[PDB]
Structure formats: structure tokens, C-alpha cells
Amino acid sequence: AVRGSIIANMLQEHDNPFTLYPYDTNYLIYTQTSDLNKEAIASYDWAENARKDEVKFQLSLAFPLWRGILGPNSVLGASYTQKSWWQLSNSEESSPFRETNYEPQLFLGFATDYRFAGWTLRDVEMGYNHDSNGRSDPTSRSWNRLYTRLMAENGNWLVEVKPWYVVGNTDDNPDITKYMGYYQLKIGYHLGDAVLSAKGQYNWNTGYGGAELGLSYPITKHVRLYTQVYSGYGESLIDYNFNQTRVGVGVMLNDLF
Ligand SMILES: CCCCCCCCO[C@@H]1O[C@H](CO)[C@@H](O)[C@H](O)[C@H]1O
Ligand SMILES: CCCCCCCCO[C@@H]1O[C@H](CO)[C@@H](O)[C@H](O)[C@H]1O
């Protein structure tokens, strides 16, 4: 199976066409943020009654569009990642959604076997990424990136680097690279069935950035208990230039590996 190998997983054909493939993690946690960005969402009619406690979730799927496109162990794929912040408890304002980040990708991935002194480069993926919050001005955030995702493992460790280059219109947030940087590092450690993870981005030039620490353990064969702690800038597109520390607990399907 090869833990956390996204590309190798996509090559494994499913009998039922409706059985999709996981790309990033899939979870639904009840959170509590340190500070809520009302300044950015001031245009909303419920902005003032915004609660610091929100239901946060992430949906992430991969769709193999063409296997073996560039030889065996290669694939032309697509993926969809959605992160949503929901003011569920806020019954006073009809439980509105504060932000949703739609993140579809089109890539060319390869399942590899390169040795790096104990480590093994399992995935090499290169593609285009679109990320917008589907909002109308002034609360509209959006940016496009061309990237490369590398994944390597070493026993109970997993490391994934994802450098990128911004392409296209950045008018909705001209300085988004100031807070996001030029790459994303992800680390995962397997302590038996417990999975510890780290995911962050950092601009070494400006000093801005954010990080995410997570810990899961299986409830059953498919679901897991997940605890997350984000801290820094760029949690969501609307909060790309807003700093906050968020803690949440909930359920998770798949983790890093
Ligand atoms: C490494 C393989 C990458 C496959 C992703 C296909 C991206 C096609 O997508 C196109 O990419 C262009 C890049 O300059 C953009 O200018 C276009 O707006 C976008 O539609
Ligand atoms: C395979 C390992 C790839 C690591 C990706 C790191 C790339 C991030 O590197 C960044 O590049 C920018 C443009 O040159 C510089 O301005 C930044 O100072 C630098 O941090």
C-alpha cells in the first residue's frame, strides 16, 4: 500500500467508479480561535456577532484522469481540497459560513523509488493550483500557483516539500506571498497507530508565516480522533494577513500516512 503515497494510491485501480482517492487529509473539528478577523469580514451583516468558536473541516479528493500518460507509474490527475470555517454554534445569525477555500489542482504525478540514505522519494508531482474563497469584493481572496510536491519516507517518518511559483492575477491580495512564502513543508511521525504531524509555510525574507501541529489516533478502522493547533498567518485566504492561534478537536478519516 505504501503509507501516505498519494500517487501510488491513485494508480491502484478501484472496482467501483464511485470509490474516490484521498489527496490531503479529511477531517471535521470543533475549533476555538484566539482572535477573529472581523476587520476583513466587516462587510458582512453578521460580522459584529462573529463568535471565536467555529466548526472547521477539510475535504480532499484526487481523481486519476489518465494513468500511464508518461509511462508506467505516472498519472495525469486532478484534486479538490476544500477548507471551511463555520459559525455553527452562532444560532443568532442563522449559523453562517465565514469562509470556504476551494482548491482544485491539475497535475502530472509519478510514483518513484529513489534512495536518499534510508529515505525513499515516493512521490514526485508537478501541477497547477487554483485557490479562491468564492467571495465577491471586497472579501474576495484568490491566487494561482504552479508547484512541485515531493514526498519521501524513512521508517516512521514522512516529509513532503511543496515549493511553488505564483502565476496570474493577484489583485485580490497583491502581497499574499509576503505571508505565505514560496513553499510548504509537511512532516509526519508514526508512533504505533498514533500519527503526529506538522505543516507550515514561512517567508524567510519577511519573517511572516504560519504552522500547524496535529495528532490523531484511530477510533475505528476508518475514523480517528484528531487534535489540531494552528498558529500564525495564512490559516485561510481571508486571514492570509491575519495572525491567530487555533485549537480544535474532532473526527478524521485519513491522516498524513
Ligand atoms: C507539470 C504539468 C502541469 C500540468 C498543469 C496544467 C496547467 C494548465 O493550466 C493553465 O496553466 C497556465 C500556466 O501558465 C495558466 O496561465 C492558465 O491560466 C492555466 O489554465
Ligand atoms: C527540493 C528542495 C526545494 C526547496 C524549495 C525552497 C525554495 C524556497 O526558496 C526561496 O526562493 C525565493 C526565490 O528565489 C527566495 O527569494 C527566498 O529567499 C527563498 O527562501
Taken as a whole, the chain contains a residue count of 257
Ligand 1 center–CA 129 separation, angstroms: 9
* Residues 6+ positions from 45 with CB-CB distance below 8 Å: none
In three-state secondary structure terms, 8 is helix
Ligand 1 center–CA 147 separation, angstroms: 10
Quote the cell numbers at residue 211. 504552522
For residue 123, the number of C-alpha atoms closer than 13 Å in the C-beta half-sphere is 28
Quote the cell numbers at residue 120. 525513499
Quote the cell numbers at residue 84. 471551511
With contact defined as beta carbons under 8 Å apart, do 210 and 229 qualify? Answer: no
For the chain, the domain total comes to: 1
Does residue 67 have a known ligand-binding role? no
* Alpha-carbon span 29 to 27, nearest angstrom: 6
With contact defined as beta carbons under 8 Å apart, do 95 and 116 qualify? Answer: no
Q: One-letter amino acid identity for 110? A: F
Does residue 122 have a known ligand-binding role? no
Instruction: Write the CATH number for 183.
Output: 2.40.230.10
With contact defined as beta carbons under 8 Å apart, do 77 and 116 qualify? Answer: no
* Alpha-carbon span 257 to 70, nearest angstrom: 26
The β-bridge relationship of strands 27-33 and 243-252 is antiparallel
Active site annotation includes 132: yes
Does residue 135 have a known ligand-binding role? yes
Q: Which of 159, 152, 157 is nearest to 113 (CA)?
A: 152
Angle, CA 77 vertex, CA 73 and CA 78 arms, to 5°: 160
* Alpha-carbon span 91 to 94, nearest angstrom: 5
- Ligand 1 binding pocket, CB closer than 6 Å: 106-108, 126-128, 167
Kindly give the number of the ligand 2 atom that is closest to the alpha carbon of 182: 8
Alpha carbon of 243 to those of 112, 142, 231: distances in Å? 38, 18, 7
Which region, left, alpha or beta, applies to residue 71 given φ > 0 means left and ψ of -120 to 50 means alpha? left
With contact defined as beta carbons under 8 Å apart, do 6 and 23 qualify? Answer: yes
Q: Which domain holds residue 107?
A: 1-257
Quote the cell numbers at residue 192. 504505533
**Active-site hit among 89, 130, 142, 216:** 130
